Amino acid sequence: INTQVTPGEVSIQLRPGAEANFMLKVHPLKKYPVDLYYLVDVSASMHNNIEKLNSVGNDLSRKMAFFSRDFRLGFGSYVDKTVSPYISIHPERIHNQCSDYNLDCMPPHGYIHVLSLTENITEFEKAVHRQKISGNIDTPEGGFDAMLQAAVCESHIGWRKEAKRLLLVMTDQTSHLALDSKLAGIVCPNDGNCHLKNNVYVKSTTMEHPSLGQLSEKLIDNNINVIFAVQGKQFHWYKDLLPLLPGTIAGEIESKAANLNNLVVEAYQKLISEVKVQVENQVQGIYFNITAICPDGSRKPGMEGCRNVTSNDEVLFNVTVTMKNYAIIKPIGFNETAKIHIHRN
Amino acid sequence: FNLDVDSPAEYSGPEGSYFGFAVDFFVPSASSRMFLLVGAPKANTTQPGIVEGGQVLKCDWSSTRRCQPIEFDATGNRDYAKDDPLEFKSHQWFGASVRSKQDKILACAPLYHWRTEMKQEREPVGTCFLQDGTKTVEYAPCRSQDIDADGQGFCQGGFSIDFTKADRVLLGGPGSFYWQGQLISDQVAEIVSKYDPNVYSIKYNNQLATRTAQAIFDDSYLGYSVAVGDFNGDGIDDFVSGVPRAARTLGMVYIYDGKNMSSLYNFTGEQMAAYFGFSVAATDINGDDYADVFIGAPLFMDRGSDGKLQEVGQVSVSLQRASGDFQTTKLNGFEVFARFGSAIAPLGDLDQDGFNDIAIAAPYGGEDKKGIVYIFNGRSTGLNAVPSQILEGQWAARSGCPPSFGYSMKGATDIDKNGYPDLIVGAFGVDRAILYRARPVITVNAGLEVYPSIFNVRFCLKADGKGVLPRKLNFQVELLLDSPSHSKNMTISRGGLMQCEELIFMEYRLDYRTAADTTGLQPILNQFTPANIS
Amino acid sequence: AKEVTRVLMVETHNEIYDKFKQSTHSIYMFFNTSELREAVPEPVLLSRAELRLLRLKLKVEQHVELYQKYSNNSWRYLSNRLLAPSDSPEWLSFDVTGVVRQWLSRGGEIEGFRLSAHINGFTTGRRGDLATIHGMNRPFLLLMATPLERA
Ligand SMILES: *[C@@H]1O[C@H](CO)[C@@H](O[C@@H]2O[C@H](CO)[C@@H](O[C@@H]3O[C@H](CO)[C@@H](O[C@H]4O[C@H](CO[C@H]5O[C@H](CO)[C@@H](O)[C@H](O)[C@@H]5O)[C@@H](O)[C@H](O)[C@@H]4O)[C@H](O[C@H]4O[C@H](CO)[C@@H](O)[C@H](O)[C@@H]4O)[C@@H]3O)[C@H](O)[C@H]2NC(C)=O)[C@H](O)[C@H]1NC(C)=O
Ligand SMILES: *[C@@H]1O[C@H](CO)[C@@H](O[C@@H]2O[C@H](CO)[C@@H](O[C@@H]3O[C@H](CO)[C@@H](O)[C@H](O)[C@H]3NC(C)=O)[C@H](O)[C@H]2NC(C)=O)[C@H](O)[C@H]1NC(C)=O
Ligand SMILES: *[C@@H]1O[C@H](CO)[C@@H](O[C@@H]2O[C@H](CO)[C@@H](O)[C@H](O)[C@H]2NC(C)=O)[C@H](O)[C@H]1NC(C)=O
Ligand SMILES: *[C@@H]1O[C@H](CO)[C@@H](O[C@@H]2O[C@H](CO)[C@@H](O)[C@H](O)[C@H]2NC(C)=O)[C@H](O)[C@H]1NC(C)=O
Ligand SMILES: *[C@@H]1O[C@H](CO)[C@@H](O)[C@H](O)[C@H]1NC(C)=O
Ligand SMILES: *[C@@H]1O[C@H](CO)[C@@H](O)[C@H](O)[C@H]1NC(C)=O
Ligand SMILES: *[C@@H]1O[C@H](CO)[C@@H](O)[C@H](O)[C@H]1NC(C)=O
Ligand SMILES: *[C@@H]1O[C@H](CO)[C@@H](O)[C@H](O)[C@H]1NC(C)=O
Ligand SMILES: *[C@@H]1O[C@H](CO)[C@@H](O)[C@H](O)[C@H]1NC(C)=O
Ligand SMILES: [Ca+2]
Ligand SMILES: [Ca+2]
Ligand SMILES: [Ca+2]
Ligand SMILES: [Ca+2]
Ligand SMILES: [Ca+2]
Ligand SMILES: [Mn+2]
């Protein structure tokens, strides 16, 4: 049934105190359909990155034409929460934060879904030009909320179950954390559901920023691969965040800020070459131990799995389920799942 | 482990007013009646033009648990010119932080949007209201001539406050110097004496505060949580501040000096973006007379057996020594996404065993996110890892925003005069403030003598307690063979000798009916003693 | 009476930050000669040229050191000025008529002035997200030249 993962389902019965291992074969394929999303910050600190993003549209298609065979592209923007002290609530500055500079800039917004994933690219070049720049007061810019909203709301974005989901988030500075909203007064957590009324996050002033762990769990559940394209000194900061976020890598952008297509190519190649698997087990009494086998011959069990792997290279995952409902074990970023059913007795 | 869970004092308030955001005790020295302080930042007042201004309700502890708010500033928005609002008190979140000394009540609004003299922008500076008796004064530390977010524009004063034993008040505003932070400490006498409503800057003569740091120190959130404690042994409590945003978003704790703001020690978190220093409390745990530092990290991710990261939370305890070195012990969370360590509040010597006790609560744990509160005891070497008592919320979620039981609590203040510091827990989601009373703790020693072992069985026992207790107690015992059982209702006075008798493995039960006092507190047995021998 | 004109500077990222990317010690304003020739062709027709700058809220001490580009390999000193400690964006005017007149007929790739110490169009002074935003009144070269037909 399943394509990438060889066993569709394995049903094993085991008495407590005795172990019962099985075989979990993984065979990555070639020419993965790609659904790439652009979560770009339109804050005032990126008056040049917005114009740098202009030319990616037609050019990246040529590069992707010989990795994948079908490409679908979308767009998105985010600034920050529409509250104080993040933004200025002055009557003259509530709608335009560039009044003191006498500049025409977009009003700040939590998250706006400008354009969904479409085969048409001409829609992308039309969409990049009609969106202006925005800004606010405080240095950090809330991006994790935009990631959560672009991941959970699958219907609005238009993700495909048969394609490799890709959410490429670009920032230069640090993002707002979960409990930073206590200054504004919002003191209860994000639920994590869909709250996009009409391509706009209306629930940006009544709920806090999502937790890092909750965001990672939602990304894993939605099979979303994230590329952290950054240009500032915070490249190191986002690089140290990679162990915290499973199936996520970060790349560097130069000051001249034109290696976006190459960065995307390298990120896609790295994501395809990494195979990591984690088990989301809810059954009580069972213990999960995973022993990964690499094509290179180096036995490297654990969450890291095997790197530098391509097609026609079968990666083995020896799992020994023991005892002291079903549990789903699946690779990160793979559209298929390996659900195991156990006999409770 | 002595908290009464079968009859907690429950306080109601205005619906949808965050009743229970800040809870604190009120124990006036002049009067013999000790009141209570609860916060409701979203409670509508009688002020003209003020919507959801907020108020600090004062609740009584007597049988008629009726509550009423305290009048602090019963007037509308001030004016700077004709048809010009000098203040924007709407949505000011008044009463977010409440701290009370013997007879001084300090209610602080962190969203006090005072328009500046010249720029006249709605930047919130944050003020406080200090009341001691009939006279009331207004305290505005962040309101000064350094305007805009550079110096003090978004200072947001009154976010976290504390009172020093040396008759001093510590105020921390995390938004100063582009959200770097500040620690403004002032003497109560100067504020009380110099109260001129005409002047706004209200510059003081003994005002010491941290100055602006370097550019890379931006977004530090200094003063996010404040505490008072003695470290160098000079007779004045030092200042402890939580810094969960410095060190390139790693987590830090800054310790200053109450004399001239000298940096004594520092702390650093281990995990990036782990919220190190979100809530800091200073209290002793091993009875060495040295004030230790308690630091809790709500959002902490740990590595499991399979490497799957789980957000359970982590609380770090620092054991201060005579030399000055700090021994840090990490207490991991118990439930995923429970935000363990969000609120930390000392309880003092809860069970009167010498060592003090502390409480750490998880506001989003349990079934349906009803909030879980953990009670931790104290040892000579740190504190007991496993919890000693579990407190659970009995109210479900009214709306999407969860009740968050245990988000803020106050303790270490005796109210019923039994010698046991009671604890109040306030949840703003369901607009209730719950007070838990400490049941009497009776330590009991049991001894069985059998001679010869190859017959005479003669069991003996004694009872002792701390505080006010009934003079006479009732105990029920039992007998087992290998009539096989003999029950007996005996009476042992407090401090008595071996109550020995013979009958021709024992289990003892305390009578919860006759031992109950007039209020209804049933004495609880010691959990650290065994109930059977041989 | 005399005709006036304005010569805008180059973009901060296009040509200003080409080799002098981080000129923290002194802010640099660069120009090229094509726009100066467009403003007025005749070097002798330039009756007067002025440099317009917007002062910041220093209010402590202002000492500006004015160097100029001699053959793009040395420095040239003309004069110095001070800014009154006033919390207002006051307008500054410098007499650079000789330099502009010399550069109008002198072929070159880029020319500029050093403003050392011993502003609109640049960093405002609010560190963070409101630092690198540009606005109008970007530093330009004010010119007062007579029309060719009249003279
Ligand atoms: C526990 O952690 C604490 C937090 O990390 C730490 O506190 C930090 O201590 C260090 C040193 O002990 C301290 O660094 C000093 O900061 C001084 C300002 O408070 C600074 O004074 C100079 O700068 C002031 C403002 O800086 C601006 O202006 C400067 C020009 O004046 C400019 O160069 C700067 O870049 C910036 O724009 C200024 O007002 C003042 O007049 C001084 O000029 C110190 O500078 C020293 O270094 C210069 C060379 O750069 C020398 O000329 C001279 O020796 C100066 O003294 C110095 O940088 C941090 O500020 C503290 N941080 C906080 C927050 O308080 C504790 O020390 C730690 N405890 C332990 C036991 O480790
Ligand atoms: C996860 O992604 C995989 C890779 O994109 C999917 O695998 C392939 O799915 C295609 C679906 O678009 C299949 O194409 C169709 O397959 C059916 C067989 O059931 C044929 O009748 C159709 O003609 C064919 N359509 C074409 C070729 O246009 C591929 O055959 C299939 N395998 C390969 C090697 O490409 C997974 O389906 C997807 N999983 C889920 C749950 O969506
Ligand atoms: C406080 O008073 C206001 C109005 O007197 C109540 O209504 C809130 O304010 C306006 C009314 O036009 C609405 O936009 C808000 O949505 C109302 N709030 C809610 C929660 O409905 C408000 O309910 C009062 N609050 C309390 C706690 O009594
Ligand atoms: C005021 O601050 C000064 C400087 O921070 C303090 O002087 C130092 O204090 C520490 C703490 O005991 C000593 O270890 C140093 O030897 C002192 N001298 C230095 C650093 O040169 C001073 O103690 C503080 N208090 C008072 C009352 O002056
Ligand atoms: C979308 O692509 C189709 C395919 O050629 C093309 O005909 C159409 O014009 C494109 N849309 C736009 C808006 O250009
Ligand atoms: C699980 O298996 C691994 C690899 O075989 C080995 O370290 C050990 O047997 C188990 N490890 C743990 C941590 O349970
Ligand atoms: C998996 O590991 C177990 C030991 O835990 C071993 O007995 C078994 O043979 C291994 N399976 C494979 C396919 O190597
Ligand atoms: C002891 O006291 C209990 C309750 O007061 C009573 O029910 C019982 O009859 C008494 N006597 C014995 C032998 O238990
Ligand atoms: C150079 O001069 C031309 C003249 O048309 C002008 O358009 C341009 O902005 C100037 N600066 C450059 C090319 O950096
Ligand atoms: Ca921001
Ligand atoms: Ca001290
Ligand atoms: Ca101690
Ligand atoms: Ca104790
Ligand atoms: Ca009590
Ligand atoms: Mn920004």
Author numbering:
A (entry chain B): 72 to 395, 404 to 424
B (entry chain A): 1 to 454, 474 to 501, 519 to 540, 559 to 588
C (entry chain D): 76 to 193, 207 to 239
What's the paper's own text on this?
TGF-β is synthesized as a latent form (L-TGF-β) containing a 25-kDa N-terminal latency-associated peptide (LAP) and a 12-kDa C-terminal growth factor (mTGF-β) domain. Notably, LAP remains non-covalently associated with mTGF-β after cleavage, which prevents mTGF-β from binding to TGF-β receptors. Myeloid lineage cells present the latent form of transforming growth factor-β1 (L-TGF-β1) to the membrane using an anchor protein LRRC33. Integrin αVβ8 activates extracellular L-TGF-β1 to trigger the downstream signaling functions.
We used a αVβ8/L-TGF-β1/LRRC33 ternary complex of 2:2:1 stoichiometry for structural determination, in which integrin αVβ8 contains only the headpiece involved in L-TGF-β1 binding (i.e., residues 1–594 of αV subunit and residues 1–456 of β8 subunit). To understand the interactions between integrin αVβ8 and L-TGF-β1, we focused on one αVβ8 headpiece and the L-TGF-β1 dimer within the EM map. In contrast to other integrins whose headpieces adopt an open conformation upon ligand binding, the αVβ8 headpiece remains closed in complex with L-TGF-β119,31. The absence of a metal ion in the conserved adjacent to metal ion-dependent adhesion site (ADMIDAS)19,31 is observed in our αVβ8/L-TGF-β1 structure. In our structure, the RGD tri-peptide (215−RGD−217) of L-TGF-β1 inserts into the cleft between αV β-propeller and β8 βI domains, similar to the reported αVβ8/L-TGF-β1 and αVβ6/L-TGF-β1 structures. However, the adjacent proximal loop (207−INGFTTGR−214) and integrin-binding (IB) helix (218−LATIHGM−224) of L-TGF-β1 undergo tremendous conformational changes. Interestingly, rather than forming a continuous α-helix with 218−LATI−221, His222 of L-TGF-β1 flips outward and disrupts the secondary structure of the IB helix. Instead, in our 2:2 αVβ8/L-TGF-β1 complex, His222 is stabilized by Thr87 and His88 of L-TGF-β1, and His118 of integrin β8 through van der Waals interactions. Moreover, Tyr172 of integrin β8 forms hydrogen bond with Thr212 to fix the proximal loop in the new position.
